[PDB]
Amino acid sequence: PPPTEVIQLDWWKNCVLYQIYPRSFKDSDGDGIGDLKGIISELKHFVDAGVDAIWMSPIFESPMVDFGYDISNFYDIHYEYGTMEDFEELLDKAHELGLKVLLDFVPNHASNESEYFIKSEAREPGYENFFIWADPLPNPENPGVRLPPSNWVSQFGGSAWEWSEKRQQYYLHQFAIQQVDFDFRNPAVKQEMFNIMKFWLDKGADGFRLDALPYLIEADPADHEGRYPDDPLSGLTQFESHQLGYTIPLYTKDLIELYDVVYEWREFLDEYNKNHGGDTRVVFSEGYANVSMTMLYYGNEDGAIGAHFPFNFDFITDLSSKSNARDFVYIILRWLTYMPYGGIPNWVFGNHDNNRMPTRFRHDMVDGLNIINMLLPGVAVTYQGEEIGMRDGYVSWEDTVDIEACNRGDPDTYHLYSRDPARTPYHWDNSTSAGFSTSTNTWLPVAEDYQEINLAKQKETARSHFKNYQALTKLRKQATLSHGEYDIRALSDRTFYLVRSLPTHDTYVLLFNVSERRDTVDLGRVPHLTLPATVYVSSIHSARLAGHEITSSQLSLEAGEALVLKAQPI
Amino acid sequence: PPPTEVIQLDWWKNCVLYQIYPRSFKDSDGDGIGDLKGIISELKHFVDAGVDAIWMSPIFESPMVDFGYDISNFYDIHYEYGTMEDFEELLDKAHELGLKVLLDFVPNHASNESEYFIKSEAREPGYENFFIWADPLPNPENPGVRLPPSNWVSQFGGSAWEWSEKRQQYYLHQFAIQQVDFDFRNPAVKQEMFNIMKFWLDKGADGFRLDALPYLIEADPADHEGRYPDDPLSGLTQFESHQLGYTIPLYTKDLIELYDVVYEWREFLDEYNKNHGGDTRVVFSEGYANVSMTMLYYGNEDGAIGAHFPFNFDFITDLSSKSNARDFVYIILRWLTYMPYGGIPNWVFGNHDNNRMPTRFRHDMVDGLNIINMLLPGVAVTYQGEEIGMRDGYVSWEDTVDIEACNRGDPDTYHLYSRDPARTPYHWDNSTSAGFSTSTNTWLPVAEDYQEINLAKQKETARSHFKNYQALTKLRKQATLSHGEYDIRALSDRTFYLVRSLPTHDTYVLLFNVSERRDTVDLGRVPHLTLPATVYVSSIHSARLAGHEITSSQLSLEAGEALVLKAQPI
Ligand SMILES: OC[C@H]1NC[C@H](O)[C@@H](O)[C@@H]1O
Ligand SMILES: OC[C@H]1NC[C@H](O)[C@@H](O)[C@@H]1O
Ligand SMILES: [Ca+2]
Ligand SMILES: [Ca+2]
Ligand SMILES: [Mg+2]
Ligand SMILES: [Mg+2]
Ligand SMILES: [Mg+2]
């Protein structure tokens, strides 16, 4: 029977989404700082890699206390990365290449150097109630010692309440002191969020990645007899009252009210898309929360529709080099079991806040992990460097610039908190600073292994992480990956299969030995696999090359070894 | 295409195992206490139900502090239940009816009224080191102030160490003061466990349920500078030092050494089966532990073999009336993902230690839960009463006899700890004491609902929980259920499917609405299901009767409604 026809999916339902960290991607001007002209000079890389969409970490005006997540002007570009003119040139050239471009929208908080905050702190009409402002807690026992409104702890260490001398009140900061929480019960705040998104959509952005959504809304003091209620204590003896972990964020995180805001954003975006046409503009949400609270981002049982998807962080939070094949299968099944009917699944192996994929797992697992990302149904998310297997760089206490490490850590402990090792400059080639910059003075130090692990080397050599990444993004054009069913089970503690299958179309099978030992499996146990079958992709140190025939039902895999087999249609 | 033959499995790989609680099954002599003559009189009940195997809770000589789990003589019957001759008659008539009979083996501990203990406490030669005896912890702060060897906490509340005035040492009890922990590093103790099992196998027992295995072995003082190490503190503020929950059982539970004793028991049982022939004799292990520690009961990576299976308690520990269809699917997949290849799966919905199935879930979910139990691959475990949907009985403080409630509870709290509600006499009929006894004076009070919920009523009326149970045990004879593949997914937050399929044999599909609301599903989404299909079983509250034709691909299910559909072969 000739192959069945498939209906084309909207671009966002099966895109490869690549996360750029602009400060570390490409420095065009020799200051050791990545910039918009550098991204423009390398837009061709995304076409070459088979990436469909890029999301940039924040590039808006920022005092850089949290490297861009502390925004002083939501309507202009950070001078170190470029100008508004450079941003419009990036959108033009990305669009001319067929790429979608998403921006990082940071709705929870503004810089204390924003006009919003300067005006609010001065009680300017229209801005007085823009942020969460609170009087000290009544201290009847002992006045003249001022108490914060509650025991709430900041994500970056210390009290989430900061005293303003000028306003004689505390403001809330869930992040750095310099990151002030907006009041999302203020209709003027909600309108300003629509105004910001409309500004950037009108410039031509294809959508947003929405930062820190679990922290949008905190308890209304009207519900607690006019005080901010204390979060419960954890009881964990390793954390004192200034340390993140001391409290359970019952009154400060995952409040049901935050989802109404996200559903209002989607209604806004739907109307925008209806009134503008062209490619669907989308929102992807960031939030670390339990399965129930994460799936509420998609929408709810009463028919509300939220983000196009919430990010799936499961390969960051629940899988590591300690995981066996049964763990891999059980965690993969969690998103696919709990995601609502019609939801688009997505897979995230890394980001700028977490250790790099090959450091969390092992160096010999890079290809297997990139195959899982590309072969599971839905959307693959790649963090800058995963396409070449980059590793965490070494960063000394002296070179550490992450506010989280500087606030929570010291020269002995910093490494426990710092996100800097996942933010080291991208390895283009084996030239000075790995081709990231013409300067030796980079904003973070270049990882020592850049001579071994760089993009130019992997394009030159016959087998490489990059060549495997290219073969996998190319495979996603096949109807079996865009529309095919999936079947996933462990064959042993060491090896699992993933089968994509679609009647009249080729079958594709991942076999992956995630263990540190060899494993022999019976391919007779793999559904929809008729032999012989052809190796489409192999791990860079597999005995099997692309084009190799698998004829025997008994298969011995090395530690880390992964294969994609192409087999006849069912 | 005529139906393929399947090779018949050994009896234990797909049996329906029924747990009898002898004290509450059937009183033959009017003392309000269930007995062995009682059981003999109703062995026909297991043939009628489609039960293959019965396991009895303990029937050995016991002061009854823990209603049989405190054993004073491992080689004879508790007088209230009957005589050795009654036991021999039970095995004889049970075997005549084709039934297998398992005994509850309690290797962790003996009654302090056991000869073992009386001899041990007196330091008689060969018994001195039969139990864990320890000196008080040296007190350098105030010498000769008596301290327990460690902070360890009993499962029934209070210290796990009891002072012997006679011996001037502490003994270990993980359970009641009256349950004394054997020393499993003493080869004489290990020999005595073989001696007990051989005795009962020689009488013709078909094997054992093994009690309390996670607690077998505790830290050797020789590895902790010649003291028993304190268990870590939990930090949970609701637990004082005398309360279960105060400690994390790092040195008192799940020690790797316990598994070596289990593998030794399986090696002895394999040698017994080999030398005696006839039906395979088996061991099913009891232990509440995490998934890694649970799966080690089957065997280990070195090829050691343990229990035929450890009990799967997931429908007790991890599902309830709070669970939705996605929770049901994700918990069912846990055993099937983690169980070693070649392992036999099992499903437990209740026991004498936990609230009854219809109380933990809902009254309208009974049929759907019994369907899951019978239609999942492997072994179905039924607890006394689940075949008629018995609910927890009310038991006042005054009528409470469970040591766990009496030790950990009081008149206001006892309901939090007591197991008695799940142990109320079995509802045979609507006669005095629901036909459990001719006396109104029963050892626990007969539940108030026995007029509504009894076996006789369910055998007479056209649709019942018991008739459904009978229809499901009969279905287990079909090749599709013994040898079929499985496929399980959620269609919604309310409804899931379970498909058993096998080429050339009939297809069986469970559809179950686990919610309190009506749900409409598309049957086109269900793999291997071609319409029309026939209702084989329906919940007693379903508008569909057995024999009903499902023709439409749109299906509305009322709250708690479950159907088993019979559909043409694949
Ligand atoms: O904006 C606060 C916080 N949100 C999440 C971002 O990914 C992280 O880098 C940032 O520090
Ligand atoms: O023997 C101790 C303990 N083990 C588990 C048994 O099921 C329970 O009833 C008993 O109290
Ligand atoms: Ca907030
Ligand atoms: Ca013990
Ligand atoms: Mg630059
Ligand atoms: Mg299938
Ligand atoms: Mg009696």
JSON list of C-alpha atoms in Angstrom, two decimals, chain A residues 234-237 301-302 324-341 485-487 489-494 517 522 525, chain B residues 234-237 301-302 324-341 485-487 489-494 517 522 525:
[
{"chain": "A", "resi": 234, "resn": "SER", "atom": "CA", "xyz": [10.30, 22.74, 56.70]},
{"chain": "A", "resi": 235, "resn": "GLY", "atom": "CA", "xyz": [11.94, 21.34, 59.94]},
{"chain": "A", "resi": 236, "resn": "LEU", "atom": "CA", "xyz": [15.07, 20.48, 57.87]},
{"chain": "A", "resi": 237, "resn": "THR", "atom": "CA", "xyz": [17.92, 21.08, 60.41]},
{"chain": "A", "resi": 301, "resn": "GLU", "atom": "CA", "xyz": [-11.04, 20.64, 33.45]},
{"chain": "A", "resi": 302, "resn": "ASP", "atom": "CA", "xyz": [-13.48, 23.63, 32.99]},
{"chain": "A", "resi": 324, "resn": "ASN", "atom": "CA", "xyz": [18.82, 2.91, 35.23]},
{"chain": "A", "resi": 325, "resn": "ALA", "atom": "CA", "xyz": [16.76, 2.00, 32.09]},
{"chain": "A", "resi": 326, "resn": "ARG", "atom": "CA", "xyz": [13.58, 1.38, 34.22]},
{"chain": "A", "resi": 327, "resn": "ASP", "atom": "CA", "xyz": [13.95, 4.93, 35.70]},
{"chain": "A", "resi": 328, "resn": "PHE", "atom": "CA", "xyz": [14.33, 6.38, 32.12]},
{"chain": "A", "resi": 329, "resn": "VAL", "atom": "CA", "xyz": [11.10, 4.59, 31.03]},
{"chain": "A", "resi": 330, "resn": "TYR", "atom": "CA", "xyz": [9.04, 5.49, 34.20]},
{"chain": "A", "resi": 331, "resn": "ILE", "atom": "CA", "xyz": [10.02, 9.21, 34.05]},
{"chain": "A", "resi": 332, "resn": "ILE", "atom": "CA", "xyz": [9.40, 9.47, 30.21]},
{"chain": "A", "resi": 333, "resn": "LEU", "atom": "CA", "xyz": [5.92, 7.94, 30.85]},
{"chain": "A", "resi": 334, "resn": "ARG", "atom": "CA", "xyz": [5.07, 10.60, 33.51]},
{"chain": "A", "resi": 335, "resn": "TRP", "atom": "CA", "xyz": [4.58, 13.53, 31.04]},
{"chain": "A", "resi": 336, "resn": "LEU", "atom": "CA", "xyz": [2.87, 11.23, 28.47]},
{"chain": "A", "resi": 337, "resn": "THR", "atom": "CA", "xyz": [0.50, 9.82, 31.18]},
{"chain": "A", "resi": 338, "resn": "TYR", "atom": "CA", "xyz": [-0.48, 13.17, 32.90]},
{"chain": "A", "resi": 339, "resn": "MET", "atom": "CA", "xyz": [-0.48, 15.65, 29.95]},
{"chain": "A", "resi": 340, "resn": "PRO", "atom": "CA", "xyz": [-4.06, 16.52, 28.95]},
{"chain": "A", "resi": 341, "resn": "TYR", "atom": "CA", "xyz": [-5.67, 15.06, 25.82]},
{"chain": "A", "resi": 485, "resn": "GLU", "atom": "CA", "xyz": [2.45, 6.22, 17.79]},
{"chain": "A", "resi": 486, "resn": "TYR", "atom": "CA", "xyz": [5.04, 5.47, 20.52]},
{"chain": "A", "resi": 487, "resn": "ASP", "atom": "CA", "xyz": [5.81, 2.31, 22.60]},
{"chain": "A", "resi": 489, "resn": "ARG", "atom": "CA", "xyz": [9.64, -0.30, 27.82]},
{"chain": "A", "resi": 490, "resn": "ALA", "atom": "CA", "xyz": [12.85, -1.44, 29.56]},
{"chain": "A", "resi": 491, "resn": "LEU", "atom": "CA", "xyz": [14.36, -4.73, 28.27]},
{"chain": "A", "resi": 492, "resn": "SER", "atom": "CA", "xyz": [16.59, -4.93, 31.42]},
{"chain": "A", "resi": 493, "resn": "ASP", "atom": "CA", "xyz": [17.92, -2.67, 34.21]},
{"chain": "A", "resi": 494, "resn": "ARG", "atom": "CA", "xyz": [20.44, -1.37, 31.57]},
{"chain": "A", "resi": 517, "resn": "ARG", "atom": "CA", "xyz": [28.11, -2.14, 31.81]},
{"chain": "A", "resi": 522, "resn": "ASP", "atom": "CA", "xyz": [16.58, -10.10, 22.53]},
{"chain": "A", "resi": 525, "resn": "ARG", "atom": "CA", "xyz": [10.87, -8.41, 22.50]},
{"chain": "B", "resi": 234, "resn": "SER", "atom": "CA", "xyz": [13.10, 12.78, 60.87]},
{"chain": "B", "resi": 235, "resn": "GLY", "atom": "CA", "xyz": [12.71, 16.37, 62.22]},
{"chain": "B", "resi": 236, "resn": "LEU", "atom": "CA", "xyz": [8.86, 16.08, 61.87]},
{"chain": "B", "resi": 237, "resn": "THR", "atom": "CA", "xyz": [7.58, 18.25, 64.80]},
{"chain": "B", "resi": 301, "resn": "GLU", "atom": "CA", "xyz": [21.84, -8.64, 39.48]},
{"chain": "B", "resi": 302, "resn": "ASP", "atom": "CA", "xyz": [24.24, -11.52, 40.54]},
{"chain": "B", "resi": 324, "resn": "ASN", "atom": "CA", "xyz": [-7.86, 10.24, 39.03]},
{"chain": "B", "resi": 325, "resn": "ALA", "atom": "CA", "xyz": [-7.54, 7.99, 35.91]},
{"chain": "B", "resi": 326, "resn": "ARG", "atom": "CA", "xyz": [-4.00, 9.31, 35.11]},
{"chain": "B", "resi": 327, "resn": "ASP", "atom": "CA", "xyz": [-2.94, 8.38, 38.72]},
{"chain": "B", "resi": 328, "resn": "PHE", "atom": "CA", "xyz": [-4.40, 4.85, 38.23]},
{"chain": "B", "resi": 329, "resn": "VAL", "atom": "CA", "xyz": [-2.42, 4.38, 34.94]},
{"chain": "B", "resi": 330, "resn": "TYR", "atom": "CA", "xyz": [0.84, 5.82, 36.34]},
{"chain": "B", "resi": 331, "resn": "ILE", "atom": "CA", "xyz": [0.73, 3.63, 39.56]},
{"chain": "B", "resi": 332, "resn": "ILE", "atom": "CA", "xyz": [-0.22, 0.41, 37.59]},
{"chain": "B", "resi": 333, "resn": "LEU", "atom": "CA", "xyz": [2.77, 1.07, 35.27]},
{"chain": "B", "resi": 334, "resn": "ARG", "atom": "CA", "xyz": [5.16, 1.27, 38.28]},
{"chain": "B", "resi": 335, "resn": "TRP", "atom": "CA", "xyz": [5.21, -2.51, 39.07]},
{"chain": "B", "resi": 336, "resn": "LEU", "atom": "CA", "xyz": [5.19, -3.43, 35.33]},
{"chain": "B", "resi": 337, "resn": "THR", "atom": "CA", "xyz": [8.10, -1.00, 34.56]},
{"chain": "B", "resi": 338, "resn": "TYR", "atom": "CA", "xyz": [10.32, -1.94, 37.56]},
{"chain": "B", "resi": 339, "resn": "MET", "atom": "CA", "xyz": [9.70, -5.72, 37.91]},
{"chain": "B", "resi": 340, "resn": "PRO", "atom": "CA", "xyz": [12.62, -7.84, 36.57]},
{"chain": "B", "resi": 341, "resn": "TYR", "atom": "CA", "xyz": [12.10, -9.61, 33.18]},
{"chain": "B", "resi": 485, "resn": "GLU", "atom": "CA", "xyz": [-0.07, -8.52, 26.11]},
{"chain": "B", "resi": 486, "resn": "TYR", "atom": "CA", "xyz": [-1.38, -5.44, 27.99]},
{"chain": "B", "resi": 487, "resn": "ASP", "atom": "CA", "xyz": [-1.88, -1.81, 26.93]},
{"chain": "B", "resi": 489, "resn": "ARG", "atom": "CA", "xyz": [-3.59, 4.60, 29.04]},
{"chain": "B", "resi": 490, "resn": "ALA", "atom": "CA", "xyz": [-5.89, 7.35, 30.35]},
{"chain": "B", "resi": 491, "resn": "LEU", "atom": "CA", "xyz": [-8.49, 8.73, 27.88]},
{"chain": "B", "resi": 492, "resn": "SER", "atom": "CA", "xyz": [-9.28, 11.69, 30.24]},
{"chain": "B", "resi": 493, "resn": "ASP", "atom": "CA", "xyz": [-8.72, 12.72, 33.90]},
{"chain": "B", "resi": 494, "resn": "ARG", "atom": "CA", "xyz": [-11.81, 10.48, 34.62]},
{"chain": "B", "resi": 517, "resn": "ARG", "atom": "CA", "xyz": [-18.69, 12.75, 37.34]},
{"chain": "B", "resi": 522, "resn": "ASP", "atom": "CA", "xyz": [-14.01, 8.07, 21.96]},
{"chain": "B", "resi": 525, "resn": "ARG", "atom": "CA", "xyz": [-8.75, 5.81, 20.65]}
]
